[PDB]
Amino acid sequence: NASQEEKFAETYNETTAFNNKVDGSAVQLVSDKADKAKTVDIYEDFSCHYCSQLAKETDADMKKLIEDGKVKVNIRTMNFLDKGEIGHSNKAGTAAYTIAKDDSAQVYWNFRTMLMTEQQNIWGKKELKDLADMAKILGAKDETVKKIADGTYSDEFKKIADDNAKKLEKDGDGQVSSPRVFIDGKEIKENATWPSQIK
């Protein structure tokens, strides 16, 4: 509820030292320290439990690898859990994409963490205007908040999600599911420990 959400500003308030941009259908996270960095593709859906668990398990180790220039992470959001409808995966994904495209890496990172951590509490209960309010609490620019509420990128996001599903089908084993992690194009078997592959 509203009073709970005000406190998110304390809860989801990590600092970041990397850049964010949209590259094709990826949200690319990479720092200026990148030095022969490995490309890490992460296919995920904001309604998916195992994606939320993976984020909880790996986000701290991932953040450091990005900051230190060891990896370039492509967050490749999908929306299959909405089963073709415009549901939570699309709304949450659109909101996060809007921040990724127009706003700071720090707000993006904290918003993504929030969506994954709060997943079961918020699934199906947040419209774009509500996600916009959450983005404001987490520091998004005024225009970003407006674009989330307005669904300015809803259609763009539909294509992002479809494009990531198509890429996953081509690059993997043909199955589209999530979460999935690839390092330099090779699928990782135990996703929960992928950061430990990076030396």
TrEMBL record:
Residues 38-194 form the Thioredoxin-like fold domain. The chain holds residues 46 to 242 of 242 of the full protein. It comes from the Bacteria. This is Thioredoxin-like fold domain-containing protein. It comes from Corynebacterium matruchotii ATCC 14266. The keyword Transmembrane applies. The lineage of its organism: Bacteria, Bacillati, Actinomycetota, Actinomycetes, Mycobacteriales. The modification Cysteine sulfenic acid (-SOH) is found at residue 48. Keywords: Membrane, Transmembrane, Transmembrane helix.
